[PDB]
Amino acid sequence: TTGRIVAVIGAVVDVQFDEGLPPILNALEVQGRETRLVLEVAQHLGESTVRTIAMDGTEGLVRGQKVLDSGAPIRIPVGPETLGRIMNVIGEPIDERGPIKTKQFAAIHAEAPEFVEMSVEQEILVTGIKVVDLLAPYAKGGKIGLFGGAGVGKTVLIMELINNVAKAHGGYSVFAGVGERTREGNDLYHEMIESGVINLKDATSKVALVYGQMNEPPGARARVALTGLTVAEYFRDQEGQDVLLFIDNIFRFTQAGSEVSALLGRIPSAVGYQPTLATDMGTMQERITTTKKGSITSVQAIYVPADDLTDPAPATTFAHLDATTVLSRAIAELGIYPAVDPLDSTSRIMDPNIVGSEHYDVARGVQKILQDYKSLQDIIAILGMDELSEEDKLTVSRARKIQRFLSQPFQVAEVFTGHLGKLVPLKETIKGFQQILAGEYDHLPEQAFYMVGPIEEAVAKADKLAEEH
Amino acid sequence: TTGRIVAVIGAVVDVQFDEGLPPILNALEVQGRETRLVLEVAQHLGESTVRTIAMDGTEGLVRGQKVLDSGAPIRIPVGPETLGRIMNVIGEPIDERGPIKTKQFAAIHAEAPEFVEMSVEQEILVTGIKVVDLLAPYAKGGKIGLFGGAGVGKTVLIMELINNVAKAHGGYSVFAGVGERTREGNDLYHEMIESGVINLKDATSKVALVYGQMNEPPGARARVALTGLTVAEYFRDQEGQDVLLFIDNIFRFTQAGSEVSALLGRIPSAVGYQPTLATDMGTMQERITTTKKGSITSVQAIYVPADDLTDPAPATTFAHLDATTVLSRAIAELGIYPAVDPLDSTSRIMDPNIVGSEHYDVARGVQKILQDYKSLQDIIAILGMDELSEEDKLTVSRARKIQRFLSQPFQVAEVFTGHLGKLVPLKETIKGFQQILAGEYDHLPEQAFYMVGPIEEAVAKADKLAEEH
Amino acid sequence: SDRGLCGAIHSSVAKQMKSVGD
Amino acid sequence: SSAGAVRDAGGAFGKREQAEEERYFRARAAEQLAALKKHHE
Amino acid sequence: GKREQAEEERYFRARAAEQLAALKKHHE
Amino acid sequence: VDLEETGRVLSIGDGIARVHGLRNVQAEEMVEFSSGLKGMSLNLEPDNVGVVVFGNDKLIKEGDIVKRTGAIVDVPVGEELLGRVVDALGNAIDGKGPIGSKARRRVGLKAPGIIPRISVREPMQTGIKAVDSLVPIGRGQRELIIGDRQTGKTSIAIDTIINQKRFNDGTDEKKKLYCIYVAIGQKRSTVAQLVKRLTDADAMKYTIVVSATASDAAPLQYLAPYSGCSMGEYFRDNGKHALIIYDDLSKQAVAYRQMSLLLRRPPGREAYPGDVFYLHSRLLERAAKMNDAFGGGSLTALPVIETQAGDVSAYIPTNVISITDGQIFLETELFYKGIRPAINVGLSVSRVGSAAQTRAMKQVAGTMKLELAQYREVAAFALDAATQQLLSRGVRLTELLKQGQYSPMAIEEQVAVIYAGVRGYLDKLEPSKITKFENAFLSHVISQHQALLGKIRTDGKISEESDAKLKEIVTNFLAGFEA
Amino acid sequence: YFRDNGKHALIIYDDLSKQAVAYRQMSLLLRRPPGREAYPGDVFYLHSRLLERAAKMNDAFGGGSLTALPVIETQAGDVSAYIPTNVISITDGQIFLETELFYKGIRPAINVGLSVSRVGSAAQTRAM
Amino acid sequence: YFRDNGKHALIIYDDLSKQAVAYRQMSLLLRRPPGREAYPGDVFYLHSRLLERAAKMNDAFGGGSLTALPVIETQAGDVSAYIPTNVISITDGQIFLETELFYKGIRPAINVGLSVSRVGSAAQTRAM
Amino acid sequence: STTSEQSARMTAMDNASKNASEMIDKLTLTFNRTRQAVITKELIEIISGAAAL
Ligand SMILES: Nc1ncnc2c1ncn2[C@@H]1O[C@H](COP(=O)(O)OP(=O)(O)OP(=O)(O)O)[C@@H](O)[C@H]1O
Ligand SMILES: Nc1ncnc2c1ncn2[C@@H]1O[C@H](COP(=O)(O)OP(=O)(O)O)[C@@H](O)[C@H]1O
Ligand SMILES: Nc1ncnc2c1ncn2[C@@H]1O[C@H](COP(=O)(O)OP(=O)(O)O)[C@@H](O)[C@H]1O
Ligand SMILES: [Cl-]
């Protein structure tokens, strides 16, 4: 059915249909365009007219320009053909490698899995990172979040998880470039070909790709997150297998909504955000989860504006997550990388019944001394280290060594650090921090524990520091 | 052609013409009134109707009152006859000395000088004040800006510069009373007659007065800044003379705009200001400049609302200035006058090429030790001077002596202060502070440096204190 | 004495010496 | 209000306390590295 | 603080007396 | 008669024309008024067209015949603009005849996608000691110049432009870099001095100046950064490399805020529109490094942001920090103390510190990066004898970071000045006397020892022979300096 | 139902902070006036009437009870925020929880000095 | 009336802070752009025209005067607030009154440092 | 010597707490002024937003 454009202001477009009025969340094919300009319905205004949002630039659009109704939402390719291929928000490919001819398609909009469909299987996932696996370990078949401010190491952290976990994972993966730098998309695409997870000449690709980035409009950036998970929903539902879902950055979903919230006709909420924040996030977030049939293990990078965790966009996301990784600038500026907050990052699986009493006691033991270290820092500001007692001096010594041993050089960040990357096992992490708390490395200096893999390398590095000195 | 007043709300008045609708900026004479009421055309609302801004009070206006069109903006007298005469916003004489007879008239509105017409020669201007000439020295044919809160010392500072520079300078002068005290207009008028710069009988006056004070409505205060501006343009362009413009206060232009923008039918900006803040100021400020033919050295007093420099009105003005003079309350309340902030006030001519390397190194040296003194205030607050290091005691001791030596008795301030004013040359200032930084006057007390001219009088004041014991 | 934060005692001792306790 | 509030502010006391710890453990690192010389040799 | 000035001004008012006591002796 | 391709003005005020008619007009299309002025149709409404007015709006009365251009807003592009100073639309404003460009690129084109791009390889030499060593800018990168007013923000940009004379006068084509300085908001007298400075240093011959001062209307200030970006994309696509400076994006945001609100679009945070992130992102994203297939060229962005009272946590600053690749935090505290340029080494980062540095520079800068980091930890003190030289070295190296205006140094020359401090020939020398040392040392090394600087550029590293020569040059100079 | 028919009951609102966000979304889209922090004018009244219904009945009106345990999420430990101060002023006491006390080892992390129960001190077994 | 007819008069506005709140009520009910502390843009103009009218007339215009003594209520000694700074920028000096000196017993509690009189120093008896 | 330093440290730390108390009192006022202004300013954003619909 035909419908002519009546108004165009910014990304928002109004189309008046003569009789056959389309439902909400339906794709609208705009005729008389060189590139495919698709519109999606948001509101019914009245008088057989509907308000829409543009999945691309609106320049060139004329009033009275015909726009046909598809009779369905934004339908995209889903299947094995999507693997090793980048695509738009609308579904078309963008890597100059022909059309992605899948045998079956799927709409980006769909109802979330019901309460009865929910799983309750808490199984530990051994990543490789020490600060993660010890304090806030990720659950296999669970929702993982990576909070952080401007330039604290969210991309470097998530790219390491792709490098470590996806290779070991005998299955599939889906990367989602939501509202971030297109330069990063260029970096990620080519380096995955070098590793061999995306093969060019043959169809044995592990990682599927969906992109949008901050060059695109808000309407695009609002829906790429939904476009990304829909590909992973195929690998969950139809193919009875596990799947990973790396998203970066999921703040840009919530940001992109507020960019067109005023033009849709809404009274703005607190901190200049849209009123529909909890619901718009909720309908999207709860789709990204493990059902009884399949299992999505999602990893979401979350941008924190102005390092403010109390801001609506990061704050509301905490409820949707099982495991969290709260990054800090204060920890990053010292030199600790990954700058993971040991007194903030938590996980649901952190329980003596789940992970064992040895894991729980050592993990909490690290969190005990690091919290008590903050109290001593207030005393040191007035006195100094000299006036403190013998017991308090040792607590700081053990605390500062624990801070540095939590740091670790990544394989993805070789050019940044300089040193080669590491990957520590489970019990090597448990036994490493247990020896430091017990007092087995009081004689060694704190510099030896800075940027190393297991506890053995700290003792091995102390041999070099001794001979150099 | 005749026009009818359809609506009147405060300063804003709407006029409906049948045919021959007047363009924007054109003045409109309101008929059936005792004093000459003027309405400048702001907008075209549509349906043969225009929105206007009233230069005088809008009381007594009946709906359907006849309004004529002059066919041009608010035209005012300009020439040698405007010297020693007081004008108002609409060019009329408000000194009760007949009409200002001139052979040419100028409109208050005009476009700024083009890129080709701009000048490049920035020569230094010697004020006499110590804190100014050392840290943020003014330029001949530039744009000086005196920032300050409520009662810090702007009118004292501007009258000092009028006393020093404008008296001893072979060229014309202009003063613009934009939204300040009418009492100050009375004081300035009789002071200038007493001095000689204004002459009642002889036609050899230097200063040209324009006044639209805080007793006037917003329409006057919005446009009276431009009225005084246009007088300086005549002397710059058509004659080619060195002009001295003195606007007190420039904030009142922007404040007047904030009052009308509500009634003009606009969406309010940040802190309730008009959305056209930068552009309205931009068209105004850009006219005040040194062209190829003539020259203007504008000294503008700038008000700071609630002692907040981040406020839109004082914030936007910074870009328009060559030299800044940020007056602080914290400095004033300590007793230091003039209360110019040495870690805030800056100038463009502060450069090793222009002033000299001896000037530059001493200037930054004063700023360094003051910055070190300010950093240690938290330590002195809790712990005290005893807990500081012995080298830091010398750093703090000199800084307070430098703070006090930056103070200076004023010429205009003699009437209430009692102490005689000072006028320190450029060479003596740099020589004086350089001795204190190196440490040639460490043995002398701090109160010796408080309120003195050159460094020689500071040492002489210390001997007077030694005699009293 | 060794422990600081006690007025100007350490400097007061140094006053008479020029003209124990680390 | 909360613990560790001094270094969170990042003022005079916050940065000086961070420097004060760095002074102490640099000196203790030299003493402890000297102990590794004796045990090795 | 208000008493931040109290401690600092007390220090330099004492040092002003000491410096003026040294200045008066040299004046003789 | 005609209402399809033509329209009449219903209402006009504050540079916003509501035009009846213009039925066939496109969104973001240019339109010419009866007086002669141009305008951009942004708001397409059912019974009107919200047209923003480029320039003055006094001449536009009610019922003026608004024509159609029949094309999306575009600007002139090419190598002809190099030398000329132009306005936001592209007209000449320096009084040297009308320029005749070959092509005309659109203002608001999409940024190149994932496949055309390639990682940053070749360096973008600013010629500043503190920048190229610690925060190295690569070609294709977007490096922010954030800081308060009067803290040497534009000072970095001007010295970067003057530095390119070293490369552009040479024979090598790849090493050349054409500059584009966009002036948004700042007054004409400032820009007149900037063009004067570039003319004196022989910099204008490879530079384009896109002026949009406070006297010009808000739509011109809004459009000017995009107009300048399109001029850079001419080089980007066709082999050559280019540089662009958005000075500044803060004053662009205020113009966009004014333009948006007067079209009856609702406000957001601090009265700004909802899409102010989208405003700056699409502008910056267009700066990229192209692969060999599409051209090989690139565009390097240097945006500017003005923070109020050092508040980087403000709305517009936090947006641009997350967009840009790296950032250079300039502070007032360092400026007043004497450290000019006032770059905070602890806070500022590049995120590509490897390819953007030369192998000669990587040796001396790598060690200086470590030593300065060691110093800033143990800063607030002045005592330990073991780390006495550590406190000294940091003060000695920090004095070398000072650099006067309008004098950018070569990449090989920067290795020489750091070599003296890093190897410890300034340790026994007093901190105050280091400015006098380097001034005479740089003049000495350039005058007589040209072959040594040449061989570092030839070999592309600090060789065994070159290291041996510099060892005796500094020691003999140091002895002559003191005694 | 339990309260009015002689029996006792417990109710736990987890959490009322998120309820306010939902109520805010509903009001703003209906174009009702926005109050402080974009919440509607009667955001106090929302939680006040909800909690007030929780009561203890005398023997004449059955004798039952509905016990309310509402939940509020503070931002950075700010007790004096808008939504917390409403619900704090409604209830008959409160149990403050700190992130500082949790990591130190105090679990449950109940702040003893700040937390009080005004009415329930009387309603206790004498053995305790 | 007294001013113009060769006579002298004193006027006291007690207080302009409460007048500002009354005008803010009017402006906020009128639905006009609010700024600092929700006051309108013309809140300065409100107090400026009132105070300006108090003046000293020359012998040509009767030779009388009107003397203004406006009052402002600060909040915890906030002299740098919006409405106080406006009236400070209008009037010819001011008399600050401290809560410390008044509570301590020193009445009247005039702050010596902050309080000034510009044109009053000239109009003073030589004995004083 | 030991009796002199403890008496001095008592009075020195007594002054340190009292000087800190003065800073707390004044910062509490500046906190509450800024607290109210943030509530007022952010409310005006929402009212201005609703007006333009
Ligand atoms: N390294 C330096 N050496 C000497 N002078 C400097 C240096 N850096 C900055 N300056 C001086 O500081 C002044 C202001 O610098 P600049 O023009 O960069 O300010 P800005 O940060 O761009 O702000 P604005 O846009 O308001 O001018 C200039 O007059 C310049 O001479
Ligand atoms: N594991 C790490 N090791 C060393 N440096 C890191 C690490 N992670 C991040 N960084 C630093 O941070 C920057 C990259 O951060 P990025 O991932 O872009 O943060 P964000 O995603 O929050 O913008 C680089 O400059 C790099 O030096
Ligand atoms: N140079 C100075 N020396 C001493 N006192 C001064 C000086 N400048 C200003 N003052 C004091 O400040 C008061 C107000 O000055 P004024 O110029 O009216 O400030 P503003 O113009 O900001 O209202 C005067 O009454 C005067 O006592
Ligand atoms: Cl808002």
Ligand SMILES: [Cl-]
């Ligand atoms: Cl007047």
Ligand SMILES: [Cl-]
């Ligand atoms: Cl206006």
Ligand SMILES: [Cl-]
């Ligand atoms: Cl606001």
Ligand SMILES: [Cl-]
């Ligand atoms: Cl052309």
Ligand SMILES: [Cl-]
């Ligand atoms: Cl654009």
Ligand SMILES: [Mg+2]
């Ligand atoms: Mg990232």
Ligand SMILES: [Mg+2]
């Ligand atoms: Mg004044």
Ligand SMILES: [Mg+2]
């Ligand atoms: Mg600049």
